[PDB]
Amino acid sequence: GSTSDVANLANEKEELNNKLKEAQEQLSRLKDEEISAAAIKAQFEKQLLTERTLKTQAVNKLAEIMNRK
Amino acid sequence: GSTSDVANLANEKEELNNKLKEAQEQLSRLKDEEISAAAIKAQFEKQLLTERTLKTQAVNKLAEIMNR
Questions:
Q1: Distances (CA, A) of B10 to B2, B13, B21, B50, B54
Q2: Residues 15-44 of B with CB under 8 A from A
Q3: Number of folded domains that form chain A
Q4: Torsion of CA A53, A56, A58, A63, to 10 degrees
Q5: Smallest Cα distance from A36 to chain B, Å
Q6: Would the CA dihedral through B3, B7, B10, B15 be positive or negative?
Q7: How many whole angstroms separate alpha carbon B62 and alpha carbon A53?
Q8: How many CB atoms neighbour CB B44 within 10 A?
């Protein structure tokens, strides 16, 4: 009757709510990671610009010395 | 009264089913976004190695030339 129906539905709501909360905590940790990925990407883009620049400096100076006569 | 409460509880269960499904799908989306991002990490890492390597080869050949 209504009494065991209530008992069972209150239990399922508690179970689902708990699983939902766990899911939303995961999503939130992941959302914080996606923001911290944007900063790491920018850092990588910077390091790459820098490495490229240093590479061209070395390559060009080597070509220049090899071309010296 | 009690029978109304049961009807309302069933709807509230169903809505929680919906929210959890939505979250679990969102989690699958954010999951393969961690796969794409880590494949971008590895791509950046390869490019960085390549640039540093060409840099270091040029440096070392130039040093050898300058040192007679």
A1: 12, 5, 17, 60, 66
A2: 16-17, 19-20, 23-24, 26-27, 30, 33-34, 37, 40-41, 44
A3: 1
A4: -170
A5: 12
A6: negative
A7: 17
A8: 17
CATH of the domain at B45: 1.20.5.730
The technique is X-ray
Q: What are phi and psi of B27, to 5 degrees?
A: -70, -35
- Chain A contact set for B17 (CB, 8 A): 16
Residue among B3, B21, B30, B46 with most chain A CBs within 10 A, to mutate: B30
* Header resolution in angstroms: 1.8
Cβ-Cβ contacts under 8 Å for A58 (sequence gap 6 or more): B54, B55, B58, B59, B62
Q: Which residue in A4, A14, A17, A30 has the most chain B C-beta atoms within 10 A of its own C-beta, making it the best mutation to test that interface?
A: A30
Residue B58 domain boundaries: 1-68
